[PDB]
Write an enzyme that holds these catalytic residues in place. Sequence first.
Site, PDB file in Angstrom:
ATOM      1  N   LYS A 189      -3.248  -2.512   1.771  1.00 39.03           N
ATOM      2  CA  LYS A 189      -3.943  -3.689   2.267  1.00 39.03           C
ATOM      3  C   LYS A 189      -4.474  -4.519   1.090  1.00 39.03           C
ATOM      4  O   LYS A 189      -4.659  -4.019  -0.029  1.00 39.03           O
ATOM      5  CB  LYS A 189      -5.098  -3.262   3.173  1.00 39.03           C
ATOM      6  CG  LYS A 189      -4.660  -2.524   4.435  1.00 39.03           C
ATOM      7  CD  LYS A 189      -5.859  -2.041   5.246  1.00 39.03           C
ATOM      8  CE  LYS A 189      -5.356  -1.424   6.560  1.00 39.03           C
ATOM      9  NZ  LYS A 189      -6.471  -0.880   7.341  1.00 39.03           N
TER      10      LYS A 189
ATOM     11  N   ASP B 187      -2.718  -3.062  10.492  1.00 42.44           N
ATOM     12  CA  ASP B 187      -3.444  -1.819  10.701  1.00 42.44           C
ATOM     13  C   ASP B 187      -4.931  -2.137  10.738  1.00 42.44           C
ATOM     14  O   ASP B 187      -5.486  -2.684   9.777  1.00 42.44           O
ATOM     15  CB  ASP B 187      -3.133  -0.811   9.596  1.00 42.44           C
ATOM     16  CG  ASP B 187      -3.885   0.498   9.779  1.00 42.44           C
ATOM     17  OD1 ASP B 187      -3.377   1.411  10.462  1.00 42.44           O
ATOM     18  OD2 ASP B 187      -5.010   0.611   9.274  1.00 42.44           O
TER      19      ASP B 187
ATOM     20  N   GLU C  91       3.260   7.854   3.762  1.00 41.18           N
ATOM     21  CA  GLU C  91       3.038   6.490   4.193  1.00 41.18           C
ATOM     22  C   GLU C  91       4.282   5.856   4.784  1.00 41.18           C
ATOM     23  O   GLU C  91       4.164   4.937   5.603  1.00 41.18           O
ATOM     24  CB  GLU C  91       2.555   5.656   3.013  1.00 41.18           C
ATOM     25  CG  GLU C  91       1.196   6.042   2.478  1.00 41.18           C
ATOM     26  CD  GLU C  91       0.042   5.685   3.403  1.00 41.18           C
ATOM     27  OE1 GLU C  91       0.267   5.029   4.452  1.00 41.18           O
ATOM     28  OE2 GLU C  91      -1.097   6.076   3.049  1.00 41.18           O
TER      29      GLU C  91
ATOM     30  N   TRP D 234      -5.213  -3.910  -3.186  1.00 43.40           N
ATOM     31  CA  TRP D 234      -4.553  -4.665  -4.249  1.00 43.40           C
ATOM     32  C   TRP D 234      -5.563  -5.375  -5.148  1.00 43.40           C
ATOM     33  O   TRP D 234      -5.378  -5.442  -6.370  1.00 43.40           O
ATOM     34  CB  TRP D 234      -3.543  -5.620  -3.614  1.00 43.40           C
ATOM     35  CG  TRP D 234      -2.816  -6.484  -4.583  1.00 43.40           C
ATOM     36  CD1 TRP D 234      -1.792  -6.125  -5.416  1.00 43.40           C
ATOM     37  CD2 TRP D 234      -3.075  -7.858  -4.838  1.00 43.40           C
ATOM     38  NE1 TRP D 234      -1.387  -7.211  -6.180  1.00 43.40           N
ATOM     39  CE2 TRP D 234      -2.165  -8.289  -5.833  1.00 43.40           C
ATOM     40  CE3 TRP D 234      -3.992  -8.772  -4.311  1.00 43.40           C
ATOM     41  CZ2 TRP D 234      -2.153  -9.609  -6.315  1.00 43.40           C
ATOM     42  CZ3 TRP D 234      -3.980 -10.080  -4.784  1.00 43.40           C
ATOM     43  CH2 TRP D 234      -3.065 -10.476  -5.785  1.00 43.40           C
ATOM     44  N   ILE D 235      -6.625  -5.927  -4.570  1.00 41.98           N
ATOM     45  CA  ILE D 235      -7.717  -6.474  -5.386  1.00 41.98           C
ATOM     46  C   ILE D 235      -8.324  -5.360  -6.230  1.00 41.98           C
ATOM     47  O   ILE D 235      -8.509  -5.505  -7.454  1.00 41.98           O
ATOM     48  CB  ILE D 235      -8.754  -7.166  -4.482  1.00 41.98           C
ATOM     49  CG1 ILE D 235      -8.139  -8.417  -3.829  1.00 41.98           C
ATOM     50  CG2 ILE D 235     -10.029  -7.500  -5.293  1.00 41.98           C
ATOM     51  CD1 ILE D 235      -8.957  -8.965  -2.661  1.00 41.98           C
TER      52      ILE D 235
HETATM   53 NA    NA Z   1      -3.691   3.338   4.874  1.00 39.09          NA
END
Ligand code: NA
Lengths: 122, 119
Positions: free
Chosen positions: A38, A26, A14, A42-43
């Site tokens: 993204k 992205d 990454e 995280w949620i």
């Molecule tokens: Na990704």
Amino acid sequence: QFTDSCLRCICKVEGCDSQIGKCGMDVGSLSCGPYQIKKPYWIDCGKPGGGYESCTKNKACSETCVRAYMKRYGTFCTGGRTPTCQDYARIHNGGPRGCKSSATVGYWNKVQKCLRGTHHHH
Amino acid sequence: QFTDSCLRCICKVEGCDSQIGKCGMDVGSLSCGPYQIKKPYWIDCGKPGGGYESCTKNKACSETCVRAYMKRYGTFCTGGRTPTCQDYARIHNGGPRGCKSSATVGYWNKVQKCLRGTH
Ligand code: NA
Ligand code: NA
Ligand code: NA
């Protein structure tokens, strides 16, 4: 288990330390930090830390998130099978169904190159 | 997604085909059919079929109900997180907040044994 070696090679693919503190866009979404996380991820990993960007820009909070994500989704994705790093890496790239998706195979091949040391450069 | 494997293991834990056509009391209120659906659940899944018992005694109408309930309540219960079978099973047993209840942990443990073949 989702091992530190698996985690490290995901990090390397990454961008890892070069992306500490950094975000980009992205496919229409902000993606932050060494694991390129993204906000939906995280949620899904349980909202560790103080907030989306403050967590995902940081290496330690990102790793808390990735580990929680793999615990939550690994056996879900595989359908009850013990998961391997192939599953976890493909989940990281493709989401909770990623371990079954043809879209994540090339990503796994990069993680596997890291794990197995193939065509290694200084 | 709510998968057929998750649905099947929920069915097994509840009694599944042995309960087709049957109702009985279940922790204080009537439950019917292979998925042991209570009337509030049938309301919450959109009242499919001709009526409460006529739907929930039947395997196919029950599955329509279960599938609608999971879609309706899964991401609600998890607070916007992609649900897993643990969430869906726990919602089945414990209602729209079941994925975060105590009380639904032992039920998941049974479903999980079914999914992993241990059981
Ligand atoms: Na990704
Ligand atoms: Na790097
Ligand atoms: Na019940």
